[PDB]
Structure formats: C-alpha cells, structure tokens
Amino acid sequence: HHMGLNTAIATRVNGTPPPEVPIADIELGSLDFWALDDDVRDGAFATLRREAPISFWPTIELPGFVAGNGHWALTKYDDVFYASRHPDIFSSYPNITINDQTPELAEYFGSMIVLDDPRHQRLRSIVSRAFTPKVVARIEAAVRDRAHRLVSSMIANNPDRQADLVSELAGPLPLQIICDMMGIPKADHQRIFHWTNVILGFGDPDLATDFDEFMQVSADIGAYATALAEDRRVNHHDDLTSSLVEAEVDGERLSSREIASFFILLVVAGNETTRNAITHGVLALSRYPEQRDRWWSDFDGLAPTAVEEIVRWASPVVYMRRTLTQDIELRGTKMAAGDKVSLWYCSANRDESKFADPWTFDLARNPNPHLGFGGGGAHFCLGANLARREIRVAFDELRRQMPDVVATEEPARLLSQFIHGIKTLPVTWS
Numbered sequence: 001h002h003m004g005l006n007t008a009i010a011t012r013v014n015g016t017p018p019p020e021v022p023i024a025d026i027e028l029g030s031l032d033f034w035a036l037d038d039d040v041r042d043g044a045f046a047t048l049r050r051e052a053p054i055s056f057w058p059t060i061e062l063p064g065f066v067a068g069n070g071h072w073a074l075t076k077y078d079d080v081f082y083a084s085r086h087p088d089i090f091s092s093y094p095n096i097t098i099n100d101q102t103p104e105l106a107e108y109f110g111s112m113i114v115l116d117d118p119r120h121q122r123l124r125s126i127v128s129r130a131f132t133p134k135v136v137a138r139i140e141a142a143v144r145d146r147a148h149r150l151v152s153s154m155i156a157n158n159p160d161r162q163a164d165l166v167s168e169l170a171g172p173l174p175l176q177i178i179c180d181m182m183g184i185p186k187a188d189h190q191r192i193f194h195w196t197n198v199i200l201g202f203g204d205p206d207l208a209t210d211f212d213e214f215m216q217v218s219a220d221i222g223a224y225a226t227a228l229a230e231d232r233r234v235n236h237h238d239d240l241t242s243s244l245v246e247a248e249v250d251g252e253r254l255s256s257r258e259i260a261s262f263f264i265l266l267v268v269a270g271n272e273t274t275r276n277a278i279t280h281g282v283l284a285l286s287r288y289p290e291q292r293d294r295w296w297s298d299f300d301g302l303a304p305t306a307v308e309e310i311v312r313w314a315s316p317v318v319y320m321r322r323t324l325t326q327d328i329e330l331r332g333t334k335m336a337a338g339d340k341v342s343l344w345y346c347s348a349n350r351d352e353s354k355f356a357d358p359w360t361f362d363l364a365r366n367p368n369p370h371l372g373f374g375g376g377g378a379h380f381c382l383g384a385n386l387a388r389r390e391i392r393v394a395f396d397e398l399r400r401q402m403p404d405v406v407a408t409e410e411p412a413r414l415l416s417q418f419i420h421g422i423k424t425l426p427v428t429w430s
C-alpha cells in the first residue's frame with residue numbers, strides 16, 4: 001504494497017458493513033462485551049436494530065457503584081430522537097448513566113445534567129453565553145495557538161518521528177481550552193486531566209478499578225473547585241468559575257455542592273469527549289486515505305461536513321440514560337414509570353433508516369443529522385460549538401505541519417460502556 005509510510009496501519013475498504021452478530025453473543029450488561037473491538041460492537045448494535053430495537057438489559061456492576069434496576073435500550077435513531085425531545089416523559093433525574101444515584105455521588109455529580117427544567121435551564125443560563133457560536137468564535141486565536149504549538153512540539157520532541165496522538169495533541173488541546181475558560185492556572189491543568197481521566201475511565205485497569213481511588217479523586221477535584229471558587233468570590237476574574245460563584249438561581253447563590261458539581265461537569269465534559277473525536281478522526285483518515293486527501297485539498301470548504309462526520313463516526317459519548325415519569329409503549333414494548341431507558345447514540349449513528357450508506361465514512365456527508373451531541377432539546381451538548389472548533393483547528397494544524405500523519409498501531413481502547421475512548425494512538429509522519 002500500500003502507498004504511504006511503511007509502518008502505517010492497514011487501510012480498510014470504505015463502506016464495508018460489519019457482519020451482524022448472533023444475538024446470543026450480545027451482553028450489554030457485561031464489561032466483557034465492551035472489550036470486544038468496534039467491528040463486533042457495531043455488528044451487535046446492527047443485530048439489535050434489526051431484531052430487538054428495544055431490549056432490556058441488567059445494569060453493569062462496577063465496583064462500588066449501585067447497579068440497581070436494569071434498563072430498556074433504545075438502539076434506533078427515531079426512538080433516541082423522540083426520547084431526547086420529550087424530557088417531561090424521559091427525565092434526566094436522578095442520573096444520566098445506567099447506575100443508581102447516591103447522596104455521596106451527588107455531592108460531586110449532582111449538576112444540571114441530572115436535572116430537569118426549570119432548574120436545569122436556570123443553571124445552564126449561568127454559563128451559556130460563554131459557549132455560544134459568536135463567543136466561542138472569539139477564542140479561535142487561543143485554540144490555534146495551542147494546537148499549533150502542540151503539533152510543533154510533536155515534531156521537536158520526537159527526533160524519531162513517532163508520537164502518541166492522545167497525550168501529545170488530542171488530550172492537551174481541549175484540556176487547555178476548557179481549563180483556561182474556567183480560570184484554572186496552567187500549572188494545574190495536568191492535575192485536572194488526571195482527575196477527569198479517572199472519573200471517566202473507571203473500570204479500565206489502566207485508569208482505575210478501586211472505588212476508593214475514584215472517591216478520593218472526586219473529593220480532590222471537588223476541593224480544588226471549592227478553593228478556586230472561594231478565591232474568585234473575593235477577587236473576580238473574567239472566567240467561568242467567577243460566573244458560577246457570582247450567579248443567583250431562584251434568588252440564591254449556588255451552594256458549594258452546586259459549584260463543585262458544575263465545575264466538575266464542565267471540566268469532565270471538556271476533557272473526555274473532543275479528544276476522542278480527534279483521535280478516532282485520525283484513525284479514520286489513516287484507514288481511509290481518499291478522505292484525508294479530499295479534505296486536505298479543500299480544507300475550509302469541507303471542514304463543516306468533515307467535523308460532523310468525524311463526530312458521527314466516533315460517537316464519543318456512547319449513550320445517555322433517562323428515567324420514565326409515566327408509562328409508555330414503543331415498538332410494542334410497554335415500559336413503566338420509574339424504569340430506566342438508555343439512548344444508544346453509537347447505534348443511532350449507524351441506523352440505516354436515517355442514514356444513506358451508514359458504513360461509509362464520507363467527509364462530504366450532507367445532510368448529516370447525527371446524534372453524537374445527542375438528540376437535541378433541553379440538554380443538547382453545551383460544548384458543541386467549542387468541540388467543532390477544537391476538532392477543525394486540530395486537523396488544520398496537522399494538515400499544515402505534518403500532512404501525512406498516520407497511525408502506526410491500532411488504538412489502545414478505553415474499557416467503557418459510556419465513552420468511546422482511545423487511550424493511546426501511535427502516529428508517525430515524514
């Protein structure tokens with residue numbers, strides 16, 4: 001043989017569907033299933049869309065978490081879209097992952113993402129201006145500066161022209177941007193990143209498997225948030241932590257649990273999502289060179305559709321969970337008030353009922369109504385404009401500085417049923 005650099009990973013034939021998987025081999029409530037590669041996972045969701053578009057599963061038991069009741073899995077696009085856009089029926093309270101909430105977890109994790117309106121929107125409005133397209137556009141210079149420096153450093157730091165895309169670009173770019181928006185000093189950004197890596201890596205032995213470590217990390221980032229907030233209470237800065245401590249909701253300042261939970265939500269979401277879009281995007285360019293070539297020869301013209309196709313392809317957030325407030329029926333399956341419902345974005349984003357040629361990675365795809373940022377409505381990804389900009393700038397800086405950058409090993413995949421994570425991705429360039 002194939003054209004390119006000698007140690008590049010194998011290419012793939014674009015558009016090839018994965019074989020469907022016998023349904024007896026599918027166990028969404030076992031971590032072992034999440035350790036299977038993406039082709040088996042993709043074929044398994046294909047089987048569910050065909051044979052059992054709504055299906056019930058026991059909740060995975062990770063050490064120290066309470067599985068509680070199982071969940072109804074929505075794997076079709078139209079059902080995920082519907083559930084997302086009916087929050088009075090599909091509530092975000094008490095939690096948006098499959099496990100049960102506890103008071104101990106809610107101290108750090110009881111943010112607006114696990115609330116319904118009106119309180120959810122009152123909290124979101126504290127920070128929403130900072131994430132609008134017009135305001136995010138004004139930090140293009142900061143995104144460029146850090147991406148350009150990171151790519152240059154890949155070259156300066158690696159005489160052998162081998163690097164890990166995750167630790168050297170995809171991780172540190174979004175980290176810098178969200179932490180600077182929050183007002184966190186640079187010296188602490190890597191400490192924040194280690195904390196969010198553990199929070200959203202729990203169950204993968206390379207990150208953490210001891211619940212005691214998970215709770216110490218949670219306590220430590222909560223304490224960090226509280227201390228920074230205290231500083232900003234006394235001396236304002238033009239940052240989001242200051243906005244949080246200065247705001248009032250229903251006539252009351254936020255409590256220290258509310259501040260900590262809001263801070264944690266923003267840095268976790270900012271640090272544990274875009275990096276995977278970027279890394280899966282480089283993996284895809286490596287597998288599908290004709291797509292790299294077409295984007296590189298018209299970068300600005302294709303960027304809007306290319307970024308969105310990277311998000312559809314990667315589906316960095318695998319699912320979100322809701323809880324029914326009333327009985328419903330979908331596709332002949334009667335679900336009860338109080339039951340958990342899981343929305344599988346990874347599956348919606350391959351649904352043949354909504355996408356022409358879903359197994360084709362097409363950077364010109366238009367339209368592209370993917371649910372990688374969710375189905376829309378009240379909780380639609382706050383960071384979506386920021387993420388799109390982070391992705392577009394990262395790829396532009398790769399294109400300009402090291403246009404033939406390519407993966408040289410298959411990814412080390414995060415063991416997670418929530419985050420489509422890549423821990424490392426070795427790359428090279430000429």
Ligand code: HEM
Binds near residue numbers: 269376
């Ligand atoms: C490609 C990157 C990203 C993806 C795929 C992604 C995906 C998602 C998804 C699926 C949701 C839930 C939507 C729903 O429930 O309807 C969400 C919510 C959220 N995301 Fe993003 N996200 C990304 C980047 C970011 C970034 C960079 C931030 C920066 C802080 C961020 C902040 C948030 C917040 C705060 C929420 C909660 C919104 C609310 O409850 O109103 N996200 N994201």
Ligand SMILES: C=C1/C(=C\C=C2/CCC[C@]3(C)[C@@H]([C@H](C)CCCC(C)C)CC[C@@H]23)C[C@@H](O)C[C@@H]1O
Binds near residue numbers: 062096097113268418
């Ligand atoms: C994930 C899952 C688990 C826990 C969920 C947690 C603890 C980490 C921080 C999270 C993920 C909060 C977090 C701040 C939300 C981040 C949103 C972002 C990704 C867009 C919300 C729920 C919070 C573990 C196991 O029961 C399996 C399950 O699957």
Ligand SMILES: [Cl-]
Binds near residue numbers: 157158159160161162
């Ligand atoms: Cl070297």
Ligand SMILES: [Cl-]
Binds near residue numbers: 014288289290291
């Ligand atoms: Cl192609």
Ligand SMILES: [Cl-]
Binds near residue numbers: 400
């Ligand atoms: Cl250029």
Ligand SMILES: [Mg+2]
Binds near residue numbers: 162163164
């Ligand atoms: Mg190295």
Ligand SMILES: [Mg+2]
Binds near residue numbers: 180183184185
């Ligand atoms: Mg600063």
